[PDB]
Amino acid sequence: SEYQTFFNPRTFGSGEADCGLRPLFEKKSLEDKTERELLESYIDGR
């Protein structure tokens, strides 16, 4: 998961580098009950 930081931790605080990764899910290779519904919605009919 390559993420590019945008803020400066001195004023933003810590956490940005590991943002968006849920300890109980992404970090444990587990998915929530409706997550796939979101990904399925990226389908682009032509």
């Binding site: 993420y3 001195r10 004023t11 933003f12 605080g13 943002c19 849920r22």
Partner: protein, 252 residues
């Protein structure tokens, strides 16, 4: 959240509950973006007509909550506000345009399985994910219907709607700082945010890096979950410039 479902434990580690001290009651939703910064809607903090004109001491920021009412000791953490920052161009006396506000915590919060910050979108991710049909997720402890509350955090996935269609769904003036989402009646599914959910995040999972990005902030609507109507959210990315200004000047 109307027509949603119970969230799973740790499903939204960035969800924040703005709790009023007097009287003791849920005020609005919000989100964690770092260990010291919280994002929410301006009208939650400032909008006198709806009994909203809060100072930093008037409320508590509660992070890592699941239950709406139970003081979840050992899980949730109560942080105190050092300063509230409302967008300078937000004017409640006129509209809910630029409905956004930053809250700096006195002390950094400690992350955990239940407390973790959400990502803010970059140019590419914003243009790429904010497209009609694409579904985002909304969470909050607000009302279950227009007209009564949930025991635990509610969650619902809603599709982004094409601007023109949003513009036609209401007589109310719409700006570029907002976007709308929700199912159309013929789509056969329901769901929407409602009173109490404001300030909460509208998140999307990036198919590029598997991370969750906050694309919007629950802001307003006309009633809740009405056919033909859509919920409106503050366009987080279009205000990212202001977010950076505030964090740079007052970061420390």
């Amino acid at each position: 959240i109307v027509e949603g479902s119970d969230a799973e434990i740790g499903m939204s580690p960035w969800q924040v509950m703005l709790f009023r001290k007097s009287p003791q009651e849920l005020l609005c939703g919000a989100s964690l973006i770092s260990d010291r910064w919280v994002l929410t809607a301006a009208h939650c903090l400032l909008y006198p007509p709806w009994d909203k004109n809060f100072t930093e001491n008037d409320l508590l920021v509660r992070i890592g909550k699941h239950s709406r009412t139970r003081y979840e000791r050992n899980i949730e953490k109560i942080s105190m506000l050092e300063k509230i920052y409302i967008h300078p161009r937000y004017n409640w006396r006129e509209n809910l345009d630029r409905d956004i506000a930053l809250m700096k915590l006195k002390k950094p919060v400690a992350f955990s399985d239940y407390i973790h910050p959400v990502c803010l979108p970059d140019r590419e991710t914003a243009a790429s994910l904010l497209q009609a049909g694409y579904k985002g997720r909304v969470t909050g402890w607000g009302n279950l219907k227009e007209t009564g509350q949930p025991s635990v955090l509610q969650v619902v996935n809603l599709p982004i709607v094409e601007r023109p269609v949003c513009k036609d769904s209401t007589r109310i003036r719409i700006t570029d700082n907002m976007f709308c989402a929700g199912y159309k009646p013929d789509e056969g599914k329901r769901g929407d945010a409602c009173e109490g959910d404001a300030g909460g995040p509208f998140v999307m999972k990036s198919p590029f890096n598997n991370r969750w990005y906050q694309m919007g902030i629950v802001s307003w609507g006309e009633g809740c979950d009405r056919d033909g109507k859509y919920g409106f959210y503050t366009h987080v990315f279009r205000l990212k410039k202001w977010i950076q200004k505030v964090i740079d000047q007052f970061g420390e």
